[PDB]
C-alpha cells in the first residue's frame, strides 16, 4: 500500500483514440468481448467490487478500553499495592490486609470504567450499522454482440458497457458513443450541475474531460456506451478509499490535557516519596519499612474517583448532543468542537443543498425574489398581477417533466421529478404557488411541440386555450434570453401590452446582467395568441414548415435559478465567526459560482475585496496592485498544484477570508495539513468521498448524515443525522461549557487529597495514633464525593461563552499551577486542620490529652501491652484503645464531608459570587443531601463496627468541623471579589485557575 503513489494526483490514458484504446486493453467496439475471454479476465484480476474494511473484533476494543493513560496509572497503582503487601507478608508476621484491599479495589475501578466506556461506543456502532442499506446492482454488458445484465461484481476490463438515464456507472468507462448523456459528478469531483459526457476529448485533466465515466456516478439523462478502462479497487474512488483507510488517526486535545495532568500528579507523587524516604532513613527506620512508605505515599496521591468522574462528565454532554441529533462515535470527540479555531468546510452537499431552485424572476420591469429554503419559511413574491399568471402558464405548459408516480406523501420540494434540473425547478415552483400542475396541464391540451434544438436554441409548443369564451390557440416558447429577446416586439406590462422600445430593452439588459452576476442561470419566457382566423381550430400545425410566427411574440419575463444553501447555513457561519473561528472554504467547484455562494454564506464578508476585484474597479493590470490590501483571496486548484510550503503558510497568514476552489481531495488534505503546521485545531465539515482524506486528517471530522457518502461517513468522527448546520454552533458552545466544568470538578476532587495524606505524614514524623484509616479514605474517594463531582457538570455559564476568543493551546491549559495552589495549597490545608481538630477532640474527651499522644505509636500499636496509661492514669487494654482510634476515623471522615460542603459551594463558581449565579442547580443540592445521609448511614447502622469498623458518634462531635467550613466559604468569597474589582491583579494571575 504505497502511500506516496496514492498521494499523487490521478493520471490517465484519456488522451488517446478509440483504436488505441481497443488496442491497449483488447476489445471489439461493435461486438465486445467473448464470454470465455471475459471469464479469463474475471478470474485473472478480481471482481469489480471495493474491498471490505478491516474488521475490528470486540475483545480488541474491550481490551483497549481497559488501557489508556488514566487506567494505566490506576493499574500501576494496583501493582504497587500488591508489591507492598508481598513485602509485608514475607517480612513480618500478622501482616495487615489494607494494601490488598486497596489493590483489588483499584483493579475493579479500572474494569468498571472500561465496561461503561465500551458499552457506549458499542451503542453508537449499532445505531451506525442501521444505515448501510446495500441493494445489489446489475450492469448492462455487451458480449459476443448480445446485451446481457450481469451483477456489478462480474464486470471486467475490456467489455462493452451500455448505460441509460437512471442507472449507475459500474466501473471507470471510456465513452465510445453517446446520445445526449449527462452524469452527476457531485460525489467524486464536486460538480453541482450535470456535465454532458461526449466521446470526444476536451481537457488535459481526466476529471474535466467528457470521454470518461466514473465509479459511483449516475447517468441523469441519456444513454451511452463505453469500454471499461479501470475496474475494482484500482478505480479512482477505490484509490481514494484505500488512501483514507491508510491514514493515521492522531491524538485529540483532551487526551493531551489528561496526559499533562498525570505528568504533574506523578511529579509531586514521586517527589514526596523519595523525600520522605530519605527523612525516614535519617530518623532510624529500616530499609524494609522505608520501601513500604515510599509505595504508600506514591499511591495515596492518585485520584481514583477522578477516572469515573471524568468519564461520567464527558458522557453527560454527549446525551445533550444526542437529543438534538448530533451523534459522536468516540467519547472525547465531544470536546474538540469547542477547542476548534479554524473550520474548513465543503460547498457541495455541506454548505449548499445540491438541488436546483428558482431564485429570481423578472416581470413588470421589476426583479422579484422567491423563497429558496427547504422548509419554506420566508417571503412570498406578490402573486396578484396577471403577468405572473401568464408566466405560470408559460412555464407550467412548455415543460415536459412530471413528478414520479407515488410521491403523494413527500413535500413539494423533496419529491422525485423525472427530467432535466431546469424543468424540474420550474415545475416545483409552479406546483408550489400555483397548485397542481397536472390539472393545469390537462386544462390546456398540447397540440404540437418542437423539441429543443441545438440551432433554434429554444423550446416551443402550442396548446388549446381553456378560455370558454376564446377558442383560439396559445403558443409558448422558452429559451436563452438573448435569442428570445431577438424574437419579440411587445411586452406584457401589468397585464396590458406595450411596444419593445429601447427603454425596456435596456432595462432587460440590466436585468440580465443582474441575474447573471448573481451566479444564476436565466431563461426567457414568451407567448403569443395565434389568430384563429388564419389558423382555425381544425387546421393541424405539423412540425415541418413555418406554421408559427417566430418573431412578433410577446415576452413576459425572465426566470433565473440556482442551488440555494441550507436554512441555518448563514446564521451558523456567522455564529462561528463571532466565536473567533476562521471559516475557510475548500471546494472543487467552478470559482465563478464559489465566489457568489461565499458572498452569500458569510465566508467573504460583504465589502472585502480580492486582487482581481481591485484591478477591475481601477481598470489596471493585476500585477501592479499590492496583495496586502486584499483581505479575502480565491486560490485556484491549478495554481495550488505549483505552490511551496511557505507560500501556503503565507496564504493562511495574510488572508482572513480564504476560498480554495477547484481543489482535488489530495489538495484538500494538503490544506488541512497547512492549517495544522502552525498550531491551530481543525474541524472539516463534508459529505462526499472527496472529503474522506480531509475528514480523517482533520482534528475532527463532521460528516453529513442524509446527503453524505458511506466512505466519508465511516471515516468521520461526528455525524449529523439531520443534516442541520446550526449544530456546529451548538457544538462549539457545549465544548466550552463542559471544559470550564471539568476544571471545577478536578479542583474539587483534588482538594480532598491533602486531608487524606497529611495524617500519615504526621504519623511517621510525629508518632501519633493513625488519624485516617483505609476504609474511610475509600468511603470518601469512591463514595460521597462521586455525586457532587458529577453534579458540577450541570453548571450554567457565568458570562457569555459565545463571546470570548478561542483558548490558546500553547498557554491556557486545563490544569495549571494556579489550581494546585488552591486545592493542594489553601483549601485542602484548612480541611486537613479541621480533621485533626476533630481528632484531638475525640482523644481528649476520652482521656488522652494532646501532650501525651506524641511518642505513643510504639505502644499504642503493640498488640501485647494490655496496660497503656493515659493522661489521667487509667489503664487501657489493646482492643479498647483501638475502638477509640476507629471512632476517630469515623469522625475524621465526617469532618471531610462537612468541609466538602463549602468546597462544593466555592467550586460551583470560579469568578462570580454565589448571590449572583444562584443555587438553581438541583443536582448539587441533591448531592449535598445524599453526601450527608450516606455518612450518617455508615456510622449508625448496626454491624458496621464489625464489617467496616466505623463506630457511632456522640452528637457533640459532629459540630467540630463547622467553623472551618464557614471560614473556607468566607475566604473563597473574598477571593472571588478582588478578582472582579481588580482585573489583571495579583489574585488573578496567582489564584484564577
Amino acid at each position: 500500500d504505497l502511500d506516496e503513489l496514492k498521494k499523487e494526483v490521478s493520471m490517465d490514458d484519456h488522451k488517446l483514440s478509440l483504436d488505441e484504446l481497443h488496442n491497449k486493453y483488447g476489445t471489439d467496439l461493435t461486438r465486445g468481448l467473448t464470454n470465455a475471454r471475459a471469464k479469463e479476465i474475471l478470474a485473472r484480476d478480481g471482481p469489480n467490487s471495493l474491498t471490505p474494511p478491516p474488521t475490528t473484533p470486540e475483545w480488541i476494543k474491550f481490551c483497549r478500553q481497559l488501557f489508556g493513560g488514566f487506567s494505566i496509572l490506576l493499574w500501576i497503582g494496583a501493582i504497587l499495592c500488591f508489591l507492598a503487601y508481598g513485602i509485608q507478608a514475607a517480612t513480618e508476621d500478622e501482616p495487615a490486609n489494607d494494601n490488598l484491599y486497596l489493590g483489588v479495589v483499584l483493579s475493579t475501578v479500572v474494569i468498571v470504567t472500561g465496561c461503561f466506556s465500551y458499552y457506549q461506543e458499542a451503542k453508537s456502532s449499532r445505531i451506525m450499522d442501521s444505515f448501510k442499506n446495500m441493494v445489489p446492482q446489475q450492469a448492462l454488458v455487451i458480449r459476443d454482440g448480445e446485451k446481457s445484465t450481469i451483477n456489478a461484481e462480474f464486470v471486467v476490463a475490456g467489455d462493452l458497457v451500455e448505460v441509460k438515464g437512471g442507472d449507475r456507472i459500474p466501473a471507470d468507462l471510456r465513452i465510445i458513443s453517446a446520445h445526449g448523456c449527462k452524469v452527476d459528478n457531485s460525489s467524486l469531483t464536486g460538480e453541482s450541475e450535470p456535465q454532458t459526457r461526449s466521446p470526444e476529448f476536451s481537457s488535459e485533466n481526466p476529471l474535466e474531460t467528457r470521454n470518461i465515466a466514473f465509479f459511483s456516478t449516475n447517468c441523469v439523462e441519456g444513454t451511452a456506451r463505453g469500454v471499461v478502462v479501470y475496474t475494482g479497487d484500482r478505480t479512482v474512488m477505490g484509490r481514494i478509499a484505500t488512501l483514507a483507510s491508510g491514514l493515521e488517526v492522531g491524538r485529540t486535545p483532551i487526551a493531551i490535557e489528561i496526559e499533562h495532568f498525570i505528568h504533574i500528579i506523578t511529579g509531586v507523587a514521586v517527589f514526596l516519596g523519595v523525600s520522605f524516604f530519605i527523612l525516614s532513613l535519617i530518623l532510624g527506620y529500616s530499609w524494609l519499612e522505608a520501601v513500604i512508605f515510599l509505595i504508600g505515599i506514591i499511591v495515596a496521591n492518585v485520584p481514583e474517583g477522578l477516572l469515573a468522574t471524568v468519564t461520567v462528565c464527558l458522557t453527560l454532554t454527549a446525551k445533550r448532543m444526542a437529543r438534538k441529533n448530533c451523534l459522536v462515535k468516540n467519547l472525547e470527540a465531544v470536546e474538540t468542537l469547542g477547542s476548534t479555531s479554524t473550520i474548513c468546510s465543503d460547498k457541495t452537499g455541506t454548505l449548499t443543498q445540491n438541488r436546483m431552485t428558482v431564485a429570481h424572476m423578472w416581470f413588470d420591469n421589476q426583479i422579484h425574489e422567491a423563497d429558496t429554503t427547504e422548509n419554506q419559511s420566508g417571503a412570498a413574491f406578490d402573486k396578484t398581477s396577471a403577468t405572473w399568471s401568464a408566466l405560470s402558464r408559460i412555464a407550467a405548459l412548455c415543460n415536459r417533466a412530471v413528478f414520479q408516480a407515488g410521491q403523494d406523501n413527500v413535500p413539494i420540494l423533496k419529491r422525485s421529478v423525472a427530467g432535466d434540473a431546469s424543468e424540474s425547478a420550474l415545475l416545483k415552483c409552479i406546483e408550489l404557488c400555483c397548485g397542481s400542475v397536472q390539472g393545469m396541464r390537462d386544462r390546456n391540451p398540447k397540440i404540437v411541440e418542437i423539441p429543443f434544438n441545438s440551432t433554434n436554441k429554444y423550446q416551443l409548443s402550442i396548446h388549446e386555450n381553456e378560455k370558454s369564451s376564446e377558442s383560439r390557440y396559445l403558443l409558448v416558447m422558452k429559451g436563452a434570453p438573448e435569442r428570445i429577446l431577438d424574437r419579440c416586439s411587445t411586452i406584457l406590462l401589468n397585464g396590458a401590452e406595450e411596444p419593445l422600445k429601447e427603454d425596456m430593452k435596456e432595462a432587460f439588459q440590466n436585468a440580465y446582467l443582474e441575474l447573471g452576476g448573481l451566479g444564476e442561470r436565466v431563461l426567457g419566457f414568451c407567448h403569443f395568441a395565434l389568430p384563429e382566423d388564419k389558423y382555425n381550430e381544425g387546421y393541424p400545425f405539423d412540425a415541418d414548415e413555418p406554421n408559427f410566427p417566430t418573431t412578433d411574440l410577446c415576452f413576459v419575463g425572465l426566470m433565473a435559478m440556482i442551488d440555494p444553501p441550507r436554512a441555518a447555513v448563514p446564521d451558523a457561519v456567522g455564529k462561528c465567526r463571532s466565536a473567533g473561528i476562521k471559516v475557510i472554504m475548500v471546494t472543487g467547484d467552478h470559482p465563478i459560482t464559489a465566489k457568489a455562494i461565499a458572498k452569500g454564506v458569510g465566508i467573504i464578508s460583504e465589502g472585502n475585496e480580492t486582487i482581481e476585484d481591485i484591478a477591475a474597479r481601477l481598470n489596471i493590470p493585476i500585477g501592479q496592485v499590492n496583495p496586502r490590501d486584499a483581505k479575502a483571496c480565491v486560490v485556484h486548484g491549478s495554481d495550488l498544484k505549483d505552490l511551496s510550503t511557505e507560500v501556503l503558510d503565507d496564504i493562511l497568514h495574510y488572508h482572513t477570508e480564504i476560498v480554495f476552489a477547484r481543489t482535488s481531495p489530495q489538495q484538500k488534505l494538503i490544506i488541512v495539513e497547512g492549517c495544522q503546521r502552525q498550531g491551530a485545531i481543525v474541524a472539516v465539515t463534508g459529505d462526499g468521498v472527496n472529503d474522506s482524506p480531509a475528514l480523517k486528517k482533520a482534528d475532527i471530522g463532521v460528516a453529513m448524515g442524509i446527503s453524505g457518502s458511506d466512505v466519508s461517513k465511516q471515516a468521520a468522527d461526528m455525524i449529523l443525522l439531520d443534516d442541520n448546520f446550526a449544530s456546529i454552533v451548538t457544538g462549539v458552545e457545549e465544548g466550552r461549557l463542559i471544559f470550564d466544568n471539568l476544571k471545577k470538578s478536578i479542583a474539587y476532587t483534588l482538594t480532598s487529597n491533602i486531608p487524606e495524606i497529611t495524617p500519615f505524614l504526621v504519623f511517621i514524623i510525629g508518632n501519633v495514633p493513625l488519624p485516617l484509616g483505609t476504609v474511610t479514605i475509600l468511603c470518601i474517594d469512591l463514595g460521597t464525593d462521586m455525586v457532587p463531582a458529577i453534579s458540577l457538570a450541570y453548571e450554567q455559564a457565568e458570562s457569555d461563552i459565545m463571546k470570548r476568543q478561542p483558548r490558546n493551546p500553547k498557554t491556557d491549559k486545563l490544569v495549571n499551577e494556579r489550581l494546585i495552589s488552591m486545592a493542594y495549597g489553601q483549601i485542602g490545608m484548612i480541611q486537613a486542620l479541621g480533621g485533626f481538630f476533630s481528632y484531638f477532640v475525640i482523644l481528649a474527651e476520652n482521656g488522652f490529652l494532646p501532650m501525651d499522644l506524641i511518642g505513643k505509636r510504639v505502644r499504642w500499636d503493640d498488640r501485647w501491652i494490655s496496660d497503656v496509661e493515659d493522661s489521667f492514669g487509667q489503664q487501657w487494654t489493646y482492643e479498647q484503645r483501638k475502638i477509640v482510634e476507629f471512632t476517630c476515623h469515623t469522625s475524621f471522615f465526617i469532618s471531610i464531608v462537612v468541609v466538602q460542603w463549602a468546597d462544593l459551594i466555592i467550586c460551583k463558581t470560579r469568578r462570580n459570587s454565589i448571590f449572583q449565579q444562584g443555587m438553581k442547580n438541583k443536582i448539587l443540592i441533591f448531592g449535598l443531601f445524599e453526601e450527608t445521609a450516606l455518612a450518617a448511614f455508615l456510622s449508625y447502622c448496626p454491624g458496621t463496627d464489625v464489617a467496616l469498623r466505623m463506630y457511632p458518634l456522640k452528637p457533640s462531635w459532629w459540630f467540630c468541623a463547622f467553623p472551618y467550613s464557614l471560614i473556607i466559604f468566607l475566604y473563597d468569597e473574598m477571593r472571588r471579589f478582588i478578582i472582579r474589582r481588580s482585573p489583571g491583579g495579583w489574585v488573578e494571575q496567582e489564584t484564577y485557575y
Binding site: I923, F926, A933, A936, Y940, K954
Partner: protein
C-alpha cells in the same frame, strides 16, 4: 450516689442509633423530593 454509682459508666447508644437513623432517613427523603420536584 457513692457505691451504687453504676450510671456513671453507662451510655444509651441504642436510642442514639435510633435517632441518628430517623434523621438520616428524613434527609434522604427531602433529597429525593428536591430532585424530583419539577418533573411533575
Amino acid at each position: 450516689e457513692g457505691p451504687d454509682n453504676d450510671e456513671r459508666f453507662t451510655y444509651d447508644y441504642y436510642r442514639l442509633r435510633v435517632v441518628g437513623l430517623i434523621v438520616a432517613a428524613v434527609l434522604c427523603v427531602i433529597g429525593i423530593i428536591i430532585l424530583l420536584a419539577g418533573k411533575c
